[PDB]
Paper text:
We determined the crystal structure of Vc (6-4) PL at 2.5 Å resolution at cryogenic temperature at the Turkish Light Source known as “Turkish DeLight”. The structure contains all the cofactors with well-defined electron densities and contains a total of 24 α helixes and five β sheets. We identified a critical water molecule (W22) that interacts with Asp12, Gln13, Asp106, and DMRL in Vc (6-4) PL. However, the W22 molecule interacts with Asp106 of the Vc (6-4) PL with a distance of 2.8 Å, while the same interaction occurs with Gly105 of other bacterial (6-4) PLs with a distance of over 3.3 Å. Unlike At (6-4) PL or Rs (6-4) PL, Vc (6-4) PL Glu410 amino acid faces away from FAD and interacts with Asp395 rather than a His365 residue. Cys357, Cys445, Cys448, and Cys461 sulfide atoms make bonds with Fe atoms in the cluster with each bond at 2.3 Å distance. The function of the [4Fe-4S] cluster is currently unknown; however, its distance to the FAD is 17 Å, which indicates it does not have a catalytic role in the DNA repair due to its large distance to the active site region. Notably, we have not observed a distinct electron density of amino acid residues between 478 and 485 Vc (6-4) PL. Due to the position of the 23rd helix, DNA lesions cannot bind the Vc (6-4) PL similar to Dm (6-4) PL.
These bacterial (6–4) PLs are distinct in that they contain [4 Fe-4 S] as well as DMRL and FAD cofactors.
Residue numbers in the entry: 2 to 477, 486 to 516
Amino acid sequence: RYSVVRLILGDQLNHAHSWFSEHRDDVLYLIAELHQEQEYVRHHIQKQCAFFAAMQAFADYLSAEGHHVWHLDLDASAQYNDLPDLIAQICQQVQADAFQYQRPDEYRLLEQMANLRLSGITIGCVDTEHFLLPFAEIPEQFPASKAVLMEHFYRRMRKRFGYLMTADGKPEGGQWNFDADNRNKLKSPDLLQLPTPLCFDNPVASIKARIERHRIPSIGQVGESLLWPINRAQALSLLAHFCQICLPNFGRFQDAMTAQHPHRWSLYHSRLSFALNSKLLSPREVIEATISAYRAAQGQISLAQVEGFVRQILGWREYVRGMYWSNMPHYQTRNHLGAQRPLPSYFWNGQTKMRCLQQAITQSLDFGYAHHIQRLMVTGNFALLTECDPDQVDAWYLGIYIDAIEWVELPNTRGMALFADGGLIATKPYSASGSYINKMSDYCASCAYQVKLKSGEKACPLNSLYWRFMLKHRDRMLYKTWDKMTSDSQQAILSTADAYLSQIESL
Ligand SMILES: Cc1cc2nc3c(=O)[nH]c(=O)nc-3n(C[C@H](O)[C@H](O)[C@H](O)COP(=O)(O)OP(=O)(O)OC[C@H]3O[C@@H](n4cnc5c(N)ncnc54)[C@H](O)[C@@H]3O)c2cc1C
Ligand SMILES: Cc1nc2c(=O)[nH]c(=O)nc-2n(C[C@H](O)[C@H](O)[C@H](O)CO)c1C
Ligand code: SF4
């Protein structure tokens, strides 16, 4: 039937992979929805729908290109016990002589494929041909258990790939990082000017029925249509919409949050993370499209916006991938601060009196997405200050977000947010009181708590929790604000924090 069998996973939808540059009738391509891939974490139903639709679209595109593709849905993959069983049975059925696959982007899948063994079949693993940094270079660029600085890696990447560089090898604009100009709050004139996010109309009724018929666990909600891009064409449309609509304001409101506007869930962000992680788009092409848009705008897009966007993909994404692949098997076990508190229940329903937490959790449950500052300084900050269990936080983050693959979820969550790796990524806890939220958002205007109150009834819980965290880990000018208080005020704040922790289920 077939001599070579190649496997395509759900996040390896690269239309430009070297595999498909060759048109061969002795090669059979395999894409399959997998119970085991739905069982290692409780995915968002939006994420499951998006991945299934994207896999079907990729299979259809490859078949239209002439390649032999066998797409197996849950109704056809249930007969096999797991992915190795599926691979072995299909290879034996087609009498294949060789099996090949692209290197997975999670440690569990990578180890599973590495330990896969087939009788009389040569096993091969090839690069996904997606990431800017080659996989083999990770050991040198990221020593194990080494607190690699993201700024130096980002500068090296900028020099290596020639992005935002002068003719004499210097950063464009006179400085490497423009984040200081990218910390503005959304005001009423800005809120009125918020653009309509680009949404797609992808029916998901059949996919949802298939998921429910197989009793696949899931979280979140979907209607009859999915707004997320499910193919390369829709991903390119989203990229163009970002470039011509949101890019002139992406940096300016990178850290902004709001509870007023109906489009508060998107703001000026790209929302291209799923397309990049599913590999429908490449980081190189996204970066170059944004740079070309910035150069064409003739000043309408300032250097800070394009630099802040290019940092997130060139430096942060590649750096997180490198740190993950250099430290993973032991990185998963790191609990530096000894956090063991169970995750509060409202993380699954959004029923909390804290406005920031309610907005972030409800947005994640309804859209399967939250922009970066939410994940870092609302949910991440709450989990860090409340000493929530890193395992449960990782499960929530890896499941509820459509763009969540462990290679990027684990460092950002365990290290950057929870400081559970000792600072190998963040180098400092991203701990904040309610003052940061009040400065960057309008949540405190709609909150039942008072952000100007630090202790007592109706005070913002973050104010007491942050100070309790800082005093608990004081041995590492911040504490000046603590040393400038009366002892009675300090004890009132600490007792308020303890009471809030005791009633954490009623916040
Ligand atoms: C606790 C925590 C968990 C996170 N988990 C994930 C995750 O599972 N998957 C994921 O893709 N991102 C994750 N991030 C990074 C960031 O939240 C998302 O990349 C972003 O919110 C996706 O929305 P966007 O495409 O509009 O991003 P934009 O604001 O439009 O940023 C542009 C692009 O930059 C990249 N990027 C930005 N920040 C990061 C980052 N910290 N690490 C890697 N790439 C980055 C993404 O590809 C993103 O599409 C996490 C961040 C935190 C603080
Ligand atoms: C929800 C989901 N479903 C599937 C699936 O049905 N089949 C598949 O091959 N992959 C799926 N994935 C992606 C993987 O679970 C995983 O995150 C990546 O393959 C890691 O590279 C995900 C995330
Ligand atoms: S007052 Fe405190 S709890 Fe309420 S929205 Fe502001 S930071 Fe969040």
